[PDB]
């Protein structure tokens with residue numbers, strides 16, 4: 037699949053073929069400086085946002101932390117939080133998602149940041165969405 041180039045935020049776009057074991061998704065962009073305190077990347081089914089297999093949500097709040105969760109039919113599950121905040125307001129990032137058989141691995145600027153165990157089948161994910169305090173240069177699939 038060809039990359040999404042300069043997609044406007046909020047963005048949602050199809051992942052051709054769906055998530056597959058071994059697929060790497062790169063999100064390259066820049067956190068905005070003075071335009072809110074959260075952004076999110078969502079791996080989801082369709083365009084509604086009610087079924088999100090993996091919600092990755094950095095929050096520049098309470099010292100900085102990231103939330104990971106899953107939404108099923110509108111309902112959020114148990115939150116996983118890491119206090120490590122590897123993003124900075126105004127700064128560019130390379131955010132890499134790797135789909136593996138039991139989990140996602142998430143790399144930020146070349147360093148493993150978190151994993152997230154699958155709670156729903158990843159093959160049902162056909163769409164990526166990005167929202168909040170970020171601008172995007174590209175989303176690639178490889």
Ligand SMILES: C[Se]C[C@H]1O[C@@H](OCC[Si](C)(C)C)[C@H](O)[C@@H](O)[C@@H]1O[C@@H]1O[C@H](CO)[C@H](O)[C@H](O)[C@H]1O
Nearest residue numbers: 074076091092093103104105106112113114115116
């Ligand atoms: C308005 Se209810 C949802 C919020 O629940 C909050 O828990 C509230 C518990 Si009491 C009502 C006992 C004080 C969570 O801290 C918050 O992170 C959580 O926020 C959601 O978190 C979700 C992830 O779990 C999404 O990020 C969603 O966007 C965000 O609104």
